[PDB]
Each structure stands twice: as C-alpha cells, then as structure tokens.
Amino acid sequence: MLIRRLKDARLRAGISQEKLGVLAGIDEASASARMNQYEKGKHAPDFEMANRLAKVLKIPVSYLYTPEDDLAQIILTWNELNEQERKRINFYIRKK
Amino acid sequence: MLIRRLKDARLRAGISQEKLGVLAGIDEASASARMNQYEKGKHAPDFEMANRLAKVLKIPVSYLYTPEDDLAQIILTWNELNEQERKRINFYIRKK
C-alpha cells in the first residue's frame, strides 16, 4: 500500500486514524496504533483490510496501490463519474 | 490482489507460473507452487512482491488491485500512452 494515498484519502474524508480503523473493523484499543503503522509505512494491511478502508473512505481500493500520481488522479476522479461519462472516456481510451 | 488480473496479465506476457515467480525473486524450487497459490487466491503476495510481479509483467502494479473491469482497462491502456496523450486524457478527467 502507498502511505500517501491512504493519508490523503483519510484527510479528504475528515476522519481520524482511530475512527478509520474502528469502522474498518480493528478493535478500538488497537485501532489508532495499527492505523498509524499503516500510515507511516511501518507495515502494510492485507487486501481485505484495504477494501474495508476504501469503503469507509469512499474511494476505489486500487487508488491505495497506485504509485503513478497522474493515474491515481484518474482513479480518484473516475470514482465520481456517471455511467455515460465513464463509458465516454472508456472509448477515448479504447482507441489508443 | 485480484487473481483474474494476475492471470490475465501473465497470459498476455506469454510466460509460465514458474518463470514469473523466478523472475520476481521466488526460489526456483518454490516458484511454481507459490505462484499457483497466488493465482488460485489461496493467499496473496505482499505489495513488494506485487511490484516485482508487475515489473516482470510490464503493467502498472495497481492493475493487480483494481476490482472494476472498466477502470482496470483504463489502467492497462494508460500504461501504453505517450506523455502528450496521457496529459491529453488527464484534462478530459480534470474537468469532470
């Protein structure tokens, strides 16, 4: 997991390390210590935990794994496009 | 990691489970057994291993973590766009 992606997305959500961890199913007593390990890159969550984090954060989960800043922006923005404008840009890309 | 993403990308590369594992730094004696665990979803690699896999497979690493088929296609295709056509579609998206 890339730590900047997790931290940026948490701060956009307006929630603390603890609340993110508790909503993602970490025991309350461990939640802030565990989230801080993740956010400092001390160790990384399993994919199942990342999905729970992404659902709390309302982002596509692969945003957390995208090292390319410009691709990460596409992911984050796509997340808020309608079905017409998704399929729109889909075929901008499907020609390449 | 999503197993379909890893398998699709390996088969596009034209290489076996063993060769993928060996190039990604797994010991030769374990390489095919380990890769098959990953591809069957029996357990999942750490992010550092996923990055080594992605570099062998010549894909952006977050392709392996993207459950949305249409977003995964954007990732895969972006991977083969030039700097002008990357920045092109960048601003198709930056207006949203």
Author numbering:
A (entry chain A), B (entry chain A): 1 to 96
Give the article text:
Controller proteins play a key role in the temporal regulation of gene expression in bacterial restriction–modification (R–M) systems and are important mediators of horizontal gene transfer. They form the basis of a highly cooperative, concentration-dependent genetic switch involved in both activation and repression of R–M genes. Here we present biophysical, biochemical, and high-resolution structural analysis of a novel class of controller proteins, exemplified by C.Csp231I. In contrast to all previously solved C-protein structures, each protein subunit has two extra helices at the C-terminus, which play a large part in maintaining the dimer interface.
The calculated Matthews coefficients were 2.38 Å3 Da− 1 (one monomer in the asymmetric unit) and 2.01 Å3 Da− 1 (two monomers in the asymmetric unit) for the cubic and monoclinic structures, respectively. Thus, there is a crystallographic dyad between the two subunits in the cubic form, whereas the subunits are related by a noncrystallographic dyad in the monoclinic form. The total dimer interface area of C.Csp231I is 1410 Å2 compared to 1040 Å2 in C.Esp1396I and 710 Å2 in C.AhdI. The striking feature in C.Csp231I is not that the dimer interface is larger, but rather that 75% of the dimer interface is contributed by the extended C-terminal helical region (helices 6 and 7; residues 67–98). This is achieved by the interleaving of the final two helices from each monomer. In fact, the five-helix bundle that makes up the main conserved domain only creates 310 Å2 of buried surface area on its own. Surprisingly, this domain contains the only pair of interchain H-bonds (Ser62-Thr66); in contrast, C.AhdI and C.Esp1396I contain a total of four and five interchain H-bonds, respectively. The analysis of B-factors in the cubic crystal form of C.Csp231I reveals that the extended C-terminal region of the protein, comprising helices 6 and 7, is significantly more mobile than the rest of the structure.
